Every structure is written in C-alpha cells, then in structure tokens.
Design a protein around this ligand. Structure first.
Ligand code: SFG
Length: 214
C-alpha cells in the first residue's frame, strides 16, 4: 500500500489538516505520476522526502505571511506549507502550463487557500504582481545567485527568503553570498527546520530582504 502517513511526524506537522495532506499525497502518487510530474521512484518518498520536509519550513514563517513559492512544479514546497499552516496565504509561481493545470486541479480539489500564477520570477509583471510578499520559498529551482536575484524583488523590505537546499546549502552560500548581498539579501545563513522530526532536518538557505536597493 504505502500511502499511509508517517507518524507521529505527519500529525505533528499537519495536525487537524492531516487528511488534506493525505489527499495531496494521493494525488501526487496517482495523477501526478500518470502525468509525468512525479517520478515513479518518489512515490515511496512522498511523506518523508517531500510533504514533511517541505512543510517544516513553516517554522520560519510568521502567522499570516503572504508567501510566493517560486517554481512550485507539482506544489512543493507551497502546498504542504499551506496545508500545514492555514494562516498563510500561499501563491504558487510556475511557468509550465502542464504543471499549472495540475496545480489548479489539486488546489480546487482541496479547498486550500492557495493561488496560482503562471509566469517566471524574473518577469517585470510578476515582480509587480507579487511584490511586497512576506516570504519567498523554493526548492530545486536554481543556483543560489540566480535564485536570490529572482527572490529578492518579490519580498517586502525585511521579508524572508527560504530556499530549501539540502547538504549543498553551505557550499552554495559560500559561493554566492557576495552576489546575494548585491541582489538585496542580508543576514544570509544556513538554518535547519523540523529537527524534532527529520534526520537530516530540512536544510534551508535563509535570508532577509535588506534595506539596500539592488
Ligand atoms: N524563472 C522561473 N520562474 C518560476 N519558475 C521556474 C522558473 N524556472 C523554472 N521554474 C520552475 O521550477 C521548477 C523546477 C523543479 N525542478 C522544482 C519543482 C518543485 N519546486 C519541487 O521541489 O519538486 C519547474 O517546475 C520550473 O518550471
């Protein structure tokens, strides 16, 4: 079978919306695979590697944050985040129409307060449409320099960038810190989330939108 939630982590993270989480995992395991959006090998990793690892980065988001998920793909990390944290207002930014079709289907079949923008982060109209967001999250999108260039315009002054990055976080920070600062980041550091539940924990390149103009 192997679609039943990993406990107690799943209830820790999703609480009363565990059922929404399970519905989402099922659709990723079903139509997500049938449509070529979820790799077959990932089906048995949907809880620990995808839903849980993505949703724990909510530990770094304040109540009621407006969040842009840059390059959401099949909904990761934005949809696990929205399910875990109903207080958030999540927007999934994704350019591929095949993927946005998928996302709209799921978001309506879940009742989750998630919106979908089909566009690329570097587009002027996107920067206007999603400017002033409280946070910009991402996973598996781009190297940290381009990612930060894409993220900072969408974040209000003193907002937060959360780039899920894994064991390559530190290297990436060390390589790109300088140009990250030039793009408007300050206080760049590697942080971990969900360390009560996951080993390794989720590893996130955290930054603030500093006051400097890029
Ligand atoms: N400039 C861009 N702006 C927004 N999304 C992009 C951009 N470039 C690539 N993408 C998307 O980023 C996603 C890359 C995927 N590898 C990641 C999907 C998802 N974030 C995941 O972790 O499973 C794709 O779905 C792309 O269509």
């Amino acid at each position: 079978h192997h679609m039943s939630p990993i406990e107690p982590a799943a209830s820790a993270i999703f609480g009363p919306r565990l059922g929404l989480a399970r519905r989402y995992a099922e659709a990723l395991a079903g139509p997500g695979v049938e449509r070529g959006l979820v790799g077959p090998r990932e089906v048995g990793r949907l809880w620990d590697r995808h839903l849980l690892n993505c949703a724990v980065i909510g530990e770094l988001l304040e109540r009621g944050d407006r969040v842009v998920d840059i390059g959401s793909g099949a909904g990761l990390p934005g949809v696990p985040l929205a399910i875990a944290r109903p207080d958030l207002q999540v927007v999934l930014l994704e350019p591929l129409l095949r993927r946005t079709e998928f996302l709209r289907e799921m978001v309506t079949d879940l009742g989750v307060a998630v919106e979908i923008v089909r566009g690329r982060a570097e587009e002027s109209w996107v920067q206007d449409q999603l400017g002033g967001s409280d946070a910009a999250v991402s996973r598996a999108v781009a190297a940290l320099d381009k990612l930060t260039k894409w993220s900072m315009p969408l974040i209000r002054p003193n907002g937060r960038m959360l780039a899920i990055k894994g064991e390559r976080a530190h290297d990436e920070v060390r390589e790109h810190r300088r140009v990250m600062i030039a793009s408007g980041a300050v206080d760049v550091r590697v942080v971990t989330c969900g360390a009560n539940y996951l080993r390794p924990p989720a590893t996130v390149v955290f930054a603030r939108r500093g006051k400097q103009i890029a």
